[PDB]
Design brief:
InterPro entries: Cas9, Cas9-BH, Cas9_PI, Cas9_REC, Cas9_RuvC, HNH_CAS9, HNH_nuc, RNaseH_sf. Its EC number is 3.1.-.-. It is an enzyme of class 3 (hydrolase). The chain has 47 helices and 24 strands. It is of the alpha+beta class. The protein folds into seven domains: 224 residues, Nucleotidyltransferase, domain 5, CATH 3.30.420; 145 residues, no CATH class; 116 residues, no CATH class; 66 residues, no CATH class; 190 residues, no CATH class; 61 residues, no CATH class; 123 residues, no CATH class. The strands form seven sheets. A seven-stranded mixed β-sheet has the order 4-3-24-23-18-19-20, with no helix packed on it. The protein has a six-stranded mixed β-sheet with strand order 11-10-1-2-5-14, with helices on both faces. A three-stranded antiparallel β-sheet has the order 16-15-17, with no helix packed on it. A hairpin with a 4-residue loop joins strand 15 and strand 16. The longest helix is centred in the N-terminal third of the chain and has 31 residues. It is globular and about 100 Å long. The two termini are 47 Å apart. The relative contact order is 0.08. The chain binds three DNA and RNA strands through strand 3, strand 4, helix 1, helix 2 and helix 3.
Length: 1146
RNA sequence: UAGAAAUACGCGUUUUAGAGCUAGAAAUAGCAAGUUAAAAUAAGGCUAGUCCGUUAUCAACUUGAAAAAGUGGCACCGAGUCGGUGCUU
DNA sequence: TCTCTGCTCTGCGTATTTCT
DNA sequence: GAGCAGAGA
């Protein structure tokens, strides 16, 4: 009557089993609903549930951020058009309308087809004058003529739209650091400051480090050659410590700045008051040469002086492209005239036409064309340009990502400065346009929502619409940054209503420095028994040792106190340098407010906003130091548990006990685990949907699906056996490779989940009556149990192994707890306060109680019988598919009606569009369709695919949507929603899973008997066993006596494939390759048949390789066959079905 | 060592614009040119925000707007995917 | 005109921050 | 899985 549930949770499967107390699996007749004639079906209580893996939110978040990026870029262009509109409406009123209409075909445009000037002659004159946009940008930067307003708009919009990166914090400017000649300013500044004053010996300047990856080994000898080595560090030539940041905060070379500790390049190069700016410019030349090195990595050489180096570089790139194109065309005309057509006309060969007009990248084009250049001659400069990857480049490439926004800002500022005198409105709001260019939303403000986003946290000061200009006076930056941090910090596990402290909080140090010291003992000559440190002794070691050394260290613990962390305290005592104000605890709440602020915020002026209320306590220079100190890391527990929770025994919260208990020292965990002290019931009093009850819990997104499916499997399995509760549930835990780590995460909470949902009734004497022992096992035990008693799994044949593993889980679990009852508290979850050889006398018992726990003999027979069962409930979970509407690439225009439009008014016979849509779920319809030249209603019944785009419009009103598809007189009740992997049964018990509206999938399972899978495991692993010798030699002799098993395996494959797979050509190719290869050795034959079971695999058809050939898979490319089949509606365990005979409809 | 969120960048794809010329009933053939720009980048939605739109959830049936709740007898002998036999309403 | 066989097609590279 | 074209009716 009693039973036990075995489970096996994976990333794609949940195997379940139900055993009775003699390890037999029961079977029952289950009721069949539906209009079929079969009314009751016998089923075994063992099976598995397979599903697609759950996906992370990663791709969704990336596409959401991309959506917001494109929205904000379009808003930038709209702001710029708003600024320009009033004046631009006097020279070309339809201009912005033409730019909007530019995508449309010649007929769909309302205005003339030439966007910029609106006629052919001015447009072609413009394109001959400025071949690229960069010619126009350089012309507007350099020339001083009054330009046409439209060209100004194109230039400004081209910088505002494609504005480059923001990774450089400073004021990067290519108006002083164009060329690498900074030696004169650097050396003259050095010799103006210093006395002995060496002089230049090599002018290589930045081009030394330009040629290599950064290292001391590059720059040391080069700076010695540049400048003779009077000062091996601090020569103040171009050197790595001044050019490039140092990650450790090592002291400076010389006491010009008190040996200031070095940092990376940041805003801290503007403020260095503590050691440099208040005590001592060389560093102006240093940052100038940093500008020099980085621009020389990104900007080519400029011999002409100009305010637009990037546009000049792009013009140079264009001109060299033109010259090498002309030279290459002449060379190919002269020496290889037959290749000219292939190179310059054929746009599918990765030639020049395929690189410009086709889809070949620069790398592919170079790889194609380089043998052509090498076999020719006169190509030397082209070959070396190709070797430097600077042959026939394009102005817009993958390498433009290194360009910082300061260069575009300089060019835009130069254009506005030149052209402001002719257009007054350009001068009136130059700051507005620059603000449009340079504004970013801060990463701590997040989306600028109005309470309709589930991601936003922004708090706005005023009901105004946010814009780049009014941003500062509309968003409360302080509150928004605080909310940006506070939403991520987690509550403590003991009281989920108070925010935890920073790790550098002083109260957390009065936890920390005495918590470890509480359970340390001092054992010496002074007494005969070990004693904990007294509170007075703890205070003494703190005051002497820990108040001079941050880190606990047992060597100095010995040789400091007994022969005679506080890092925040030490730093704050080397800043304020007053021990009184730190030892003062009366004022400590304001000090924790300071600690909280320096933990929350990193942008410095926000630090000033939080510190304004404390200016009266301290002088200004130490607030400037406070800007430079930053705290990271958060504490593990809350302020109420720190101090607030007064006890009823001593007036001593935990940290008061850690400070001073004298003897009988009690640690944090013992104090909170104690109930006789009034902390445990406080934790108890401190404490309606399973979905939320797992949502905020930790876990990989894949495994959480498996856990929820496991819980629903347990619920339905309990429901199946008439609400009688189990007494054991066995769970996978491979704790001490993604599978290993994901299965180790599982048992942090699944045992809690099952124990909470299972055990729910209690009494007054005990607050839970333990009725289900939640067993938990490691896969190692089931592994040697499999490999030690000839029950081998092979994963390639069938999905029964999941259920088989579940069965093994249950049997070894129950047989272990019955064998060692006293070891419940090691494995049973719910009650704990902190081997395998007995399976190998024939009858084993607990002994302390005479119950039989294992019977070598009938038990192994029962297990063999269960593994040899043919019927195992495999159920593929039907899911409505969700995700992207279609594949992402935009196919060119075609005269096909399968192209999906990109927009409402973009007919995809003129504009192209997407292909390969994804069906959410198919829908069986039965209606009349007007087929035939003579329009007359033939009744039809066919499947239809409802794609993800059409899903909402279908569920809004199915009848109108189907009538729009052409169907007439749709039988509304007869509409059947069929998700993916909907299961159908056909003749001879041949099942098919519906992969889509127009494709099927294989559905049956080859239930190969246990002797053959044992043989195949013993064969395919032929000389890789590494066990006891005589055992593997008798296994060798066993596989040697049984070669005929191979031939009967092939008959099984032929029979199953002739019954269910219906792939004739695949079958006799397999048979012919077998018959022509029957003489090969056993290992290769058995391994190739193990690949050969892919023919009979559940799921999609897939190609597979034999000894000498790959056999193409037979795809089932139509669903006409299932419209007269038995559709099966399987429950989650698959025991409850609902068969619909579709042939009786319409 | 990974999950989850935010702010940005560079490409890519698509259609249009960048007058192709000559010899020709041409099917065409010779020759020149090629680097750039606009717009879109899930269709779209309404609370109209510089917001949201690809994560999670989901067998069937009966109630319920929804949330949700409920609905399927047992033992034994066998096993080609479950079959048979015997009690019970 | 409506179903089968055989072969081809498929968005990408980076950053800065967070919290766990 | 879908797409596409090229044959069997």
């Amino acid at each position: 009557k009693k039973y036990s549930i075995g489970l096996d949770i994976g990333t794609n499967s949940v195997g379940w089993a139900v055993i009775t107390d003699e390890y037999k699996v029961p079977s029952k007749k289950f009721k069949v609903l539906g209009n079929t004639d079969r009314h009751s079906i016998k089923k075994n209580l063992i099976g598995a549930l397979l599903f697609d893996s759950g996906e992370t939110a990663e791709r969704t978040r990336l596409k959401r951020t991309a959506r917001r990026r494109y929205t904000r870029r379009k808003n930038r262009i709209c702001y710029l058009q708003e600024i320009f509109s009033n004046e631009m409406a006097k020279v070309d009123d339809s201009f912005f309308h033409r730019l909007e209409e530019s995508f449309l075909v010649e007929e769909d445009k309302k205005h003339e087809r030439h966007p910029i000037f609106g006629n052919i002659v001015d447009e072609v004159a413009y394109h001959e004058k400025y071949p690229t946009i960069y010619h126009l940008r350089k012309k507007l930067v350099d020339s001083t003529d009054k330009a046409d307003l439209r060209l100004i708009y194109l230039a400004l919009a081209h910088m505002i739209k494609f504005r480059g990166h923001f990774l450089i914090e400073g004021d990067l400017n290519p108006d002083n650091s164009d060329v690498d000649k900074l030696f004169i300013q650097l050396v003259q500044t050095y010799n103006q400051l210093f006395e002995e004053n060496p002089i230049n010996a090599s002018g290589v300047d930045a081009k030394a480090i330009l040629s290599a990856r950064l290292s001391k080994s590059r720059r040391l000898e080069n700076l010695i050659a540049q400048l003779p080595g009077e000062k091996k560090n601090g020569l103040f030539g171009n050197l790595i410590a001044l050019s490039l940041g140092l990650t450790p905060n090592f002291k400076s070379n010389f006491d010009l700045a008190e040996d200031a500790k070095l940092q990376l390049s940041k805003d801290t190069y503007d403020d260095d008051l503590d050691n440099l700016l208040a005590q001592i410019d060389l560093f102006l030349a240093a940052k100038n040469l940093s500008d020099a090195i980085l621009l020389s990595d990104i900007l080519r050489v400029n011999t002409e002086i100009t305010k637009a180096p990037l546009s000049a570089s792009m013009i140079k790139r264009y001109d060299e492209h033109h010259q090498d194109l002309t030279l290459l065309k002449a060379l190919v005309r002269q020496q290889l005239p037959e290749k000219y057509k292939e190179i310059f006309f054929d746009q599918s060969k990765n030639g020049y036409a395929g690189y410009i007009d086709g889809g070949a990248s620069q790398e592919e084009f170079y790889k194609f064309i380089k043998p052509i250049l090498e076999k020719m001659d006169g190509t030397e400069e082209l070959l070396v340009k190709l070797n430097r990857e600077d042959l026939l480049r394009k102005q817009r490439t993958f390498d433009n990502g290194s360009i910082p926004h300061q260069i575009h800002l300089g060019e835009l500022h130069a254009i506005l400065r030149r052209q402001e005198d002719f257009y007054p409105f350009l001068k009136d709001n130059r700051e507005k346009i620059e603000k449009i260019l340079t504004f970013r939303i801060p990463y701590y403000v997040g989306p600028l929502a109005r309470g309709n986003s589930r991601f936003a946290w922004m708090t706005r000061k005023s009901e105004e619409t946010i814009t780049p200009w009014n941003f500062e006076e509309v968003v409360d930056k302080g509150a928004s940054a605080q909310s940006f941090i506070e939403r991520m910090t987690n509550f403590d596990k003991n009281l989920p209503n108070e925010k935890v402290l920073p790790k550098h909080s002083l109260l957390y140090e009065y936890f920390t420095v005495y918590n470890e010291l509480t359970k340390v003992k001092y054992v010496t000559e002074g007494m005969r028994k070990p004693a904990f440190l007294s509170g007075e002794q703890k205070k003494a070691i703190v005051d002497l040792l820990f108040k001079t050394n941050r880190k606990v260290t047992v060597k100095q613990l010995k040789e400091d106190y007994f022969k005679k962390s506080l890092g925040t305290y030490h730093d704050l005592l080397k800043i304020i340098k007053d021990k009184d104000f730190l030892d003062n605890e009366e004022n400590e709440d304001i000090l924790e407010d300071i600690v909280l602020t320096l933990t929350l915020f990193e942008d410095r002026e926000m630090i000033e906003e939080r510190l304004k209320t404390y200016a009266h306590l301290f002088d200004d220079k130490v607030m400037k130091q406070l800007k430079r100190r930053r705290y990271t890391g958060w504490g593990r527990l809350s302020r109420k548990l720190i101090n607030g929770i007064r006890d009823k025994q001593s007036g001593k919260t935990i940290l008061d006990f850690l400070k001073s208990d004298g003897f009988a020292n009690r640690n944090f965990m013992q104090l909170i685990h104690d109930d006789s002290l009034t902390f445990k019931e406080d934790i108890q009093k401190a404490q309606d949907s399973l979905h939320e009850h797992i949502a905020n819990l930790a876990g990989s997104p894949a495994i959480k699906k498996g856990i929820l499916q496991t819980v629903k499997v347990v619920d339905e399995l309990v429901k199946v056996m008439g609400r009688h509760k189990p007494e054991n549930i066995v769970i996978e835990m491979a704790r001490e490779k993604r599978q290993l780590v994901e299965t180790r995460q599982i048992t942090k909470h699944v045992a809690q989940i099952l124990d909470s949902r299972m055990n729910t009734k209690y009494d007054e004497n005990d607050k839970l009556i333990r009725e289900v022992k939640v067993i938990t096992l490691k896969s190692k035990l089931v592994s040697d149990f499999r490999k030690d008693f000839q029950f081998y799994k092979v994963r390639e044949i069938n999905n029964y192994h999941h259920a088989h593993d579940a069965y093994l889980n249950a049997v070894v679990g129950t047989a272990l707890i019955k064998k060692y009852p006293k070891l419940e508290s090691e494995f049973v979850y719910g009650d704990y306060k902190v081997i395998m050889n007995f399976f190998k006398p024939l009858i084993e018992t607990n002994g302390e109680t005479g119950e039989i726990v294992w019977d070598k003999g009938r038990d192994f027979a029962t297990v063999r019988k269960v593994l040899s069962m043919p019927q195992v409930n495999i159920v593929k979970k039907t899911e409505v598919q969700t995700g992207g509407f279609s594949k992402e690439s935009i196919r060119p225009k075609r005269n096909s009606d399968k192209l999906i439009a990109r927009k409402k008014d973009w007919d995809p016979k003129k504009y192209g569009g997407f292909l390969w849509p994804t069906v959410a779920y198919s829908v069986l319809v039965v209606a009349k369709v007007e087929k035939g030249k003579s329009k007359k209603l033939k009744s039809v019944k066919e499947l239809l695919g409802i794609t993800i785009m059409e899903r909402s419009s279908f569920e809004k009103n199915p009848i109108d949507f189907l009538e729009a598809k052409g169907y007439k007189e749709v039988k509304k009740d007869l509409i059947i929603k069929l998700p993916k992997y909907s299961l159908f049964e056909l003749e001879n018990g041949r099942k098919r899973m519906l992969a889509s509206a127009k494709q099927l999938q294989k559905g049956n399972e080859l239930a190969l008997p246990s002797k053959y899978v044992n043989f195949l495991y013993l064969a395919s692993h032929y000389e890789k066993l590494k066990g006891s010798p005589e055992d593997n030699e008798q296994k060798q002799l066993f596989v040697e006596q049984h070669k005929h098993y191979l031939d009967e395996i092939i008959e099984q494959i032929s029979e199953f494939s002739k019954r269910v797979i219906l792939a004739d050509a695949n079958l006799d190719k397999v048979l012919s390759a077998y018959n022509k290869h029957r003489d090969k050795p056993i290992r290769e034959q058995a391994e190739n048949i193990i690949h050969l079971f892919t023919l009979t695999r559940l799921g999609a058809p897939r190609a597979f390789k034999y000894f000498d050939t790959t056999i193409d898979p037979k795809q089932y490319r139509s669903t006409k066959e299932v419209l007269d089949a038995t559709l099966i509606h399987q429950s989650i365990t698959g025991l409850y079905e609902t068969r619909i005979d579709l042939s009786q409809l319409g």
